Design a protein around this motif. Sequence first.
Motif, PDB file in Angstrom:
ATOM      1  N   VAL A   5       0.839  -1.194   0.000  1.00  0.00           N
ATOM      2  CA  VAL A   5       0.000   0.000   0.000  1.00  0.00           C
ATOM      3  C   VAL A   5       0.876   1.247   0.000  1.00  0.00           C
ATOM      4  CG1 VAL A   5      -1.435   1.427   1.522  1.00  0.00           C
ATOM      5  CG2 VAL A   5      -2.124  -0.937   0.995  1.00  0.00           C
ATOM      6  N   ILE A   7       0.611   5.439   0.516  1.00  0.00           N
ATOM      7  CA  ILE A   7      -0.251   6.366   1.243  1.00  0.00           C
ATOM      8  C   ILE A   7      -0.008   7.767   0.705  1.00  0.00           C
ATOM      9  CG2 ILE A   7      -1.165   6.944   3.508  1.00  0.00           C
ATOM     10  CD1 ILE A   7       0.257   4.696   4.711  1.00  0.00           C
ATOM     11  N   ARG A  17      -4.078   4.895   9.433  1.00  0.00           N
ATOM     12  CA  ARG A  17      -4.070   3.866   8.399  1.00  0.00           C
ATOM     13  C   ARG A  17      -2.708   3.190   8.312  1.00  0.00           C
ATOM     14  NH1 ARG A  17      -9.352   2.489   6.827  1.00  0.00           N
ATOM     15  NH2 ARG A  17     -10.367   4.212   5.704  1.00  0.00           N
ATOM     16  N   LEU A  68      -3.876   4.706  -0.599  1.00  0.00           N
ATOM     17  CA  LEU A  68      -4.610   5.456   0.415  1.00  0.00           C
ATOM     18  C   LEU A  68      -4.547   6.943   0.099  1.00  0.00           C
ATOM     19  CD1 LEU A  68      -3.484   3.904   3.766  1.00  0.00           C
ATOM     20  CD2 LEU A  68      -5.877   4.196   3.130  1.00  0.00           C
ATOM     21  N   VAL A  91      -8.611   3.493  -1.272  1.00  0.00           N
ATOM     22  CA  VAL A  91      -9.342   3.842  -0.059  1.00  0.00           C
ATOM     23  C   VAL A  91      -9.151   5.333   0.177  1.00  0.00           C
ATOM     24  CG1 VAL A  91      -9.513   3.578   2.427  1.00  0.00           C
ATOM     25  CG2 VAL A  91      -9.224   1.567   0.984  1.00  0.00           C
ATOM     26  N   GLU A  93     -10.126   8.822   2.480  1.00  0.00           N
ATOM     27  CA  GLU A  93     -10.813   9.639   3.463  1.00  0.00           C
ATOM     28  C   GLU A  93     -11.629  10.672   2.700  1.00  0.00           C
ATOM     29  OE1 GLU A  93     -11.704  10.769   7.556  1.00  0.00           O
ATOM     30  OE2 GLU A  93     -11.014   8.978   6.498  1.00  0.00           O
ATOM     31  N   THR A 280      -9.863  -0.304   8.584  1.00  0.00           N
ATOM     32  CA  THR A 280      -8.663  -0.788   7.911  1.00  0.00           C
ATOM     33  C   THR A 280      -8.570  -2.307   7.966  1.00  0.00           C
ATOM     34  OG1 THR A 280      -7.661   1.209   8.848  1.00  0.00           O
ATOM     35  CG2 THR A 280      -6.251  -0.242   7.548  1.00  0.00           C
TER      36      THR A 280
END
Length: 317
Positions: A5, A7, A17, A68, A91, A93, A280
């Motif tokens: 992942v 971010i 996260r 993310l 994903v 926010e 998560t």
Amino acid sequence: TPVRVGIVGTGYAAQRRAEVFRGDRRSQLVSFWGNSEANTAKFADTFGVRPQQSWQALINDPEIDLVLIATINQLHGAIAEAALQAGKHVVLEYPLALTYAMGKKLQQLAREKGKLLHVEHIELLGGVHQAIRQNLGKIGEVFYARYSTIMGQNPAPQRWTYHHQQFGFPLVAALSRISRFTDLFGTVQQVDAQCRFWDQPNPEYFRACLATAYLQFNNGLKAEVIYGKGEVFHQNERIFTLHGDRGTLIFVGETGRLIQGQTETEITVGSRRGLFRQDTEAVLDYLTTGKPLYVDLEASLYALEVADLCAQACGYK
């Protein structure tokens, strides 16, 4: 699988996260991008991962499976569309995007290319939110609510948070909050909204802004949303109040009170750390077992619709 992942972001949502993506064996944390060198240096030291000179470089790394996104408001949709076009999981926010059309346009591409498009909204009053849900049964039909955020700042920075285009329509975050009780309050029937700005001499930043919305819901609720920050505010407000037939809920900050007749019961508000962990963990469940996520996009797509409605009433854009 394991799930690697990248971010995009270095704020609160990014760090929770990253922790749960690190401390779980079903996932690995590779790279991250941050927009300011001040905090990008810190996030690099804290998790001990190497940055990437740009986020366009990060979402095109074939040693990354899920991206993310919790970064500058206006970049969220474009990064989402591009992480998907590269066959990566996404994903976010909240926000999802700037329009409902682009939010929908994000939805079709996500499954066409067969990848996860998950949006949640936890960084802003996530614990307070579940606290309201876990107590709305105790106050009956809600007829009046006020959600006011006022944050004074002198001097106003020339950062992305006080920048017209990067920050966006100021009520996006707060309208998302008031719009996520649809099964109880109904949908929004009527909207009237204003939006005032105080500009720096650099007219693409503002020294202050005040945005207000007066919402009527189809089941009777009358709600007032207020967002304000800048150099023209001398008293702060962090209040979320809901009045109902059999009681009143009052959240000052992360502190809740239930008021029914002569009784007053302090309400326990959970940490956002816990809700970030469960979400998560619930996305790793999906990508390793197929158990569909508890949340789907309808909440974040209707939050956008309300924001498009208020922005139109404000004359914004």
